Design a protein around this motif. Structure first.
Motif, PDB file in Angstrom:
ATOM      1  N   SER A  10       0.847  -1.242   0.000  1.00  0.00           N
ATOM      2  CA  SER A  10       0.000   0.000   0.000  1.00  0.00           C
ATOM      3  C   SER A  10       0.890   1.305   0.000  1.00  0.00           C
ATOM      4  CB  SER A  10      -1.048  -0.068   1.145  1.00  0.00           C
ATOM      5  OG  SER A  10      -2.324   0.350   0.673  1.00  0.00           O
ATOM      6  N   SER A  11       0.431   2.433   0.576  1.00  0.00           N
ATOM      7  CA  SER A  11       1.139   3.721   0.422  1.00  0.00           C
ATOM      8  C   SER A  11       2.436   3.908   1.294  1.00  0.00           C
ATOM      9  CB  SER A  11       0.171   4.915   0.579  1.00  0.00           C
ATOM     10  OG  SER A  11       0.815   6.187   0.264  1.00  0.00           O
ATOM     11  N   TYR A  12       3.592   4.076   0.641  1.00  0.00           N
ATOM     12  CA  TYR A  12       4.861   4.307   1.387  1.00  0.00           C
ATOM     13  C   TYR A  12       5.078   5.773   1.667  1.00  0.00           C
ATOM     14  CZ  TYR A  12       5.943  -0.401  -0.322  1.00  0.00           C
ATOM     15  OH  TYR A  12       5.850  -1.720  -0.713  1.00  0.00           O
ATOM     16  N   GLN A  13       5.721   6.079   2.787  1.00  0.00           N
ATOM     17  CA  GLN A  13       6.026   7.420   3.232  1.00  0.00           C
ATOM     18  C   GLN A  13       7.554   7.571   3.323  1.00  0.00           C
ATOM     19  OE1 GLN A  13       3.506   9.701   4.621  1.00  0.00           O
ATOM     20  NE2 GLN A  13       2.188   8.365   3.384  1.00  0.00           N
ATOM     21  N   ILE A  14       8.145   8.489   2.559  1.00  0.00           N
ATOM     22  CA  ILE A  14       9.598   8.761   2.579  1.00  0.00           C
ATOM     23  C   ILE A  14       9.897  10.146   3.182  1.00  0.00           C
ATOM     24  CG2 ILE A  14      11.731   8.839   1.004  1.00  0.00           C
ATOM     25  CD1 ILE A  14      10.112   6.068   1.206  1.00  0.00           C
ATOM     26  N   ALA A  15      10.776  10.229   4.170  1.00  0.00           N
ATOM     27  CA  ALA A  15      11.275  11.511   4.639  1.00  0.00           C
ATOM     28  C   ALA A  15      12.433  11.865   3.728  1.00  0.00           C
ATOM     29  CB  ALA A  15      11.783  11.374   6.100  1.00  0.00           C
ATOM     30  N   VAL A  16      12.348  13.016   3.096  1.00  0.00           N
ATOM     31  CA  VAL A  16      13.366  13.496   2.191  1.00  0.00           C
ATOM     32  C   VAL A  16      14.208  14.576   2.922  1.00  0.00           C
ATOM     33  CG1 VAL A  16      13.867  14.515  -0.082  1.00  0.00           C
ATOM     34  CG2 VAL A  16      11.890  12.921   0.223  1.00  0.00           C
ATOM     35  N   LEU A  17      15.521  14.341   3.082  1.00  0.00           N
ATOM     36  CA  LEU A  17      16.407  15.231   3.847  1.00  0.00           C
ATOM     37  C   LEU A  17      17.579  15.590   2.961  1.00  0.00           C
ATOM     38  CD1 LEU A  17      14.546  13.805   6.207  1.00  0.00           C
ATOM     39  CD2 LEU A  17      16.713  13.766   7.563  1.00  0.00           C
ATOM     40  N   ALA A  18      17.374  16.580   2.077  1.00  0.00           N
ATOM     41  CA  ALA A  18      18.299  16.799   1.011  1.00  0.00           C
ATOM     42  C   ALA A  18      19.594  17.436   1.529  1.00  0.00           C
ATOM     43  CB  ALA A  18      17.660  17.677  -0.128  1.00  0.00           C
ATOM     44  N   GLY A  19      19.492  18.217   2.625  1.00  0.00           N
ATOM     45  CA  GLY A  19      20.625  18.881   3.245  1.00  0.00           C
ATOM     46  C   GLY A  19      21.172  20.020   2.400  1.00  0.00           C
ATOM     47  N   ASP A  20      22.505  20.030   2.268  1.00  0.00           N
ATOM     48  CA  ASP A  20      23.269  21.211   1.909  1.00  0.00           C
ATOM     49  C   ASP A  20      23.913  20.997   0.530  1.00  0.00           C
ATOM     50  OD1 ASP A  20      22.829  22.244   4.515  1.00  0.00           O
ATOM     51  OD2 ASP A  20      24.352  20.892   5.381  1.00  0.00           O
ATOM     52  N   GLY A  21      24.457  22.074  -0.050  1.00  0.00           N
ATOM     53  CA  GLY A  21      25.402  21.936  -1.153  1.00  0.00           C
ATOM     54  C   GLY A  21      24.651  21.435  -2.374  1.00  0.00           C
ATOM     55  N   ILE A  22      25.158  20.378  -2.973  1.00  0.00           N
ATOM     56  CA  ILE A  22      24.459  19.746  -4.128  1.00  0.00           C
ATOM     57  C   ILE A  22      23.297  18.852  -3.743  1.00  0.00           C
ATOM     58  CG2 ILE A  22      26.633  19.800  -5.442  1.00  0.00           C
ATOM     59  CD1 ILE A  22      26.688  16.531  -5.062  1.00  0.00           C
ATOM     60  N   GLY A  23      23.119  18.548  -2.457  1.00  0.00           N
ATOM     61  CA  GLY A  23      21.970  17.716  -1.951  1.00  0.00           C
ATOM     62  C   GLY A  23      20.633  17.962  -2.683  1.00  0.00           C
ATOM     63  N   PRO A  24      20.150  19.205  -2.642  1.00  0.00           N
ATOM     64  CA  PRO A  24      18.855  19.518  -3.274  1.00  0.00           C
ATOM     65  C   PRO A  24      18.844  19.299  -4.768  1.00  0.00           C
ATOM     66  CG  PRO A  24      19.306  21.135  -1.577  1.00  0.00           C
ATOM     67  CD  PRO A  24      20.627  20.324  -1.796  1.00  0.00           C
ATOM     68  N   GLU A  25      19.916  19.639  -5.453  1.00  0.00           N
ATOM     69  CA  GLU A  25      19.871  19.491  -6.902  1.00  0.00           C
ATOM     70  C   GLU A  25      19.977  18.043  -7.386  1.00  0.00           C
ATOM     71  OE1 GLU A  25      23.401  21.567  -9.176  1.00  0.00           O
ATOM     72  OE2 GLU A  25      23.426  21.896  -7.000  1.00  0.00           O
ATOM     73  N   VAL A  26      20.752  17.196  -6.689  1.00  0.00           N
ATOM     74  CA  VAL A  26      20.771  15.774  -7.052  1.00  0.00           C
ATOM     75  C   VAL A  26      19.515  15.029  -6.556  1.00  0.00           C
ATOM     76  CG1 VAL A  26      23.253  15.835  -7.401  1.00  0.00           C
ATOM     77  CG2 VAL A  26      22.254  15.042  -5.112  1.00  0.00           C
ATOM     78  N   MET A  27      18.970  15.464  -5.419  1.00  0.00           N
ATOM     79  CA  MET A  27      17.679  14.945  -4.895  1.00  0.00           C
ATOM     80  C   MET A  27      16.555  15.145  -5.919  1.00  0.00           C
ATOM     81  SD  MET A  27      16.651  13.140  -2.289  1.00  0.00           S
ATOM     82  CE  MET A  27      17.695  13.673  -0.913  1.00  0.00           C
TER      83      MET A  27
END
Ligand SMILES: CC(C)[C@H](C(=O)O)[C@@H](O)C(=O)O
Ligand SMILES: CC(C)[C@H](C(=O)O)[C@@H](O)C(=O)O
Ligand SMILES: [Ca+2]
Ligand SMILES: [Ca+2]
Ligand SMILES: [Cl-]
Ligand SMILES: [Cl-]
Lengths: 364, 364
Positions: B1-18
């Motif tokens: 059924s429905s999965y829940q993911i915590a997304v913790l992209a952090g710093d630097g390139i984190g957000p752009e590769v996330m």
């Protein structure tokens, strides 16, 4: 006046490379007028066979009566199924370091001109060369910290070791590192895990305290996991690396292996009196023992470090170093330093010792 | 059924590769009919700026309500003059591991076909290739052992950390290693310092106990100082390496750097429930952030590990892996994977994510 050396050749190739170190020392003794007396004692594997333990009471006492220990290499197949904790290498080396307070380990490693291709590094990286001195704290940290042992049983049985450092222990190894950088490229890279370990927070703090006395030396700090990576990419950027006991163990061996030429590498472990233990960086190579193949240069450069650091004979020490340089640039190479299509030009252990000693004799 | 993911992209390139990992995940969600909901939380440097600490209470609680943590990278210049002990990376990662009991760290590293020349190893050594899985014990040993701290003042001020392991902690990480070897080349190399540490004597003992259940897997033991050298000479001879917390930290990073391609490397840290934290092996690369240059493949393969290990979606996970293989063999390489005379063929972060996601869409 008359110096006394305890000679502890140990196992494997120890005795055969020791023979060459002594031959070179004899030439140095003649050239410089030094009176050095040597006594041999059993250590390691041969001590277990001959006396029941790796560090007999008689050997320990002969080291106490000496000015330095010229040490070969201990260990091999024969004893490598005793407990890791009754094995000859740890059973000889740790109590010698603890008993004589040999807090300072120096391991000089460089890529020699002309031997770059033997480094396991990529050719563009080894072409740059490197010259890295590792200074490792040897009598503190997790090796001799207490409590150490185990308690309980079954699934909940646990073991524990304690890493412990005081400011005094850190400052005396750090001053060695700064003093050494001052005579080299004036950079100390201190290696810790300060983001995790209380000992490393104190370590980095105290190294920064010691730094005030060396305003001409650049200080940087690096995490051990990052240092092990960076030595693979820019080992030419490091000069002196300063490490605690366990991080130094790992890092000095990584650097040695990076040279691709361990047979050229030696090691000094010294106390504050300048009494020390001088040994090649590599092991006892038991499969090549007794064949005249082993490279004696590591053991010969151990004797030069001994002359310099324990016996205060700087000229004698540098004569041996230059005799080694002359060998390496005159076609006197043992088999492990040659690409296998050239392995037919190899010199034997005895040829190397003869050449090096004649070079000291001739005034190199 | 429905999965829940915590997304913790952090710093630097984190957000752009996330962003690229999420784009690929969206294609996988469509292809395989998975219902996955994602919430983003601050962690690391951005959490210090936005909330005063690297692991806010709200973030911790969002991880508790999730099935897995898809984690980017934390840290950078801006916070790198706080104490090493209030810095974002250790301040995010250690309490997440301790809180969720993420005892198992898996770091798969291989030399990819065609990318051998990027390894800092000599060409004859990198040509042989390697594929080494490091299994690192993550919640025990010297990282979380007590007592930890300091006492005294002046010269006699001392700090201490305690390395502690129980048989139960060793046997559960060792079974992971043997189970993993069984599906690979059937060799576990257990890495310790049993000639010095009480924890390592117990470690080697217990690994040998666990081995009885795996008569098809070969077991060997190596000292950490020897393992760091041998990975420089024959990394193709290792399959699974099994390590305690501190030795694993060092060895996994040494192996990563040996690939010369850290942008391809991911990491799983899991508890016994299969909840885990999935992150690229490399750092936040703050100098390249916001430029579309960063290689997103490490973060994309983190999502594949998440699908496999936490969400039990083996097919989805292998589709992403194959989409990555297809990129790498179809000329879709970012700038750090190219020799600089070819650096003009480089793809951007977005081009890579688009290609990989279209490959999953097309049925790779
Ligand atoms: C034998 C062992 C205890 C020793 C050490 O860990 O110091 C060895 O690895 C070394 O480098 O001398
Ligand atoms: C940030 C640091 C505490 C961490 C570690 O030592 O585990 C890092 O080096 C890693 O490998 O995740
Ligand atoms: Ca060692
Ligand atoms: Ca690390
Ligand atoms: Cl230590
Ligand atoms: Cl540990």
């Amino acid at each position: 006046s008359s110096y006394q050396i305890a000679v502890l050749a140990g196992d494997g190739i120890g005795p055969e490379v020791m023979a060459e170190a002594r031959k070179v020392l004899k030439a140095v003794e003649a050239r410089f007028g030094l009176n050095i007396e040597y006594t041999e004692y059993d250590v390691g594997g041969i001590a277990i066979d001959n006396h029941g333990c790796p560090l007999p009471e008689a050997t320990l006492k002969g080291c106490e009566a000496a000015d330095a220990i010229l040490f070969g290499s201990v260990g091999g197949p024969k004893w490598e199924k005793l407990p890791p904790n009754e094995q000859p290498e740890r059973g000889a080396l740790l109590p010698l370091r603890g008993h004589f307070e040999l807090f300072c380990n120096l391991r000089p490693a460089k890529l020699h001109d002309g031997l770059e291709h033997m480094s396991p590094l990529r050719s563009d990286i080894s072409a740059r060369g490197f010259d890295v001195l590792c200074v490792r704290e040897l009598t503190g940290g997790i090796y001799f910290g207490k409590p150490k042992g185990r308690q309980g049983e079954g699934e909940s049985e646990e073991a524990f070791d304690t890493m412990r450092y005081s400011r005094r222990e850190i400052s005396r190894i750090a001053r060695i590192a700064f003093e050494a950088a001052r005579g080299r490229r004036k950079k100390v890279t201190s290696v810790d895990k300060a983001n995790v370990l209380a000992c490393s927070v104190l370590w980095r703090q105290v190294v920064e305290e010691v730094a005030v006395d060396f305003p001409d030396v650049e200080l940087e700090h690096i995490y051990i996991d990052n240092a092990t990576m960076q030595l693979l990419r820019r080992p030419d950027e490091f000069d002196v690396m300063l490490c605690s006991n366990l991080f130094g163990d790992i890092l000095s061996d990584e650097i040695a292996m990076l040279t691709g030429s361990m047979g050229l590498l030696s090691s000094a472990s010294m106390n504050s009196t300048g009494f020390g233990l001088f040994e090649p960086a590599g092991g006892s190579a038991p499969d090549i023992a007794g064949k005249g193949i082993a490279n004696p240069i590591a053991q010969i450069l151990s004797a030069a470090l001994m002359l310099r650091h324990s016996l205060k004979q700087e000229e004698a020490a540098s004569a041996i170093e230059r005799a080694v340089t002359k060998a390496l640039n005159s076609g006197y190479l043992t088999g492990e330093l040659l690409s296998s299509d050239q392995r037919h030009k190899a010199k034997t252990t005895v040829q190397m010792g003869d050449f090096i000693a004649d070079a000291v004799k001739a005034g190199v």
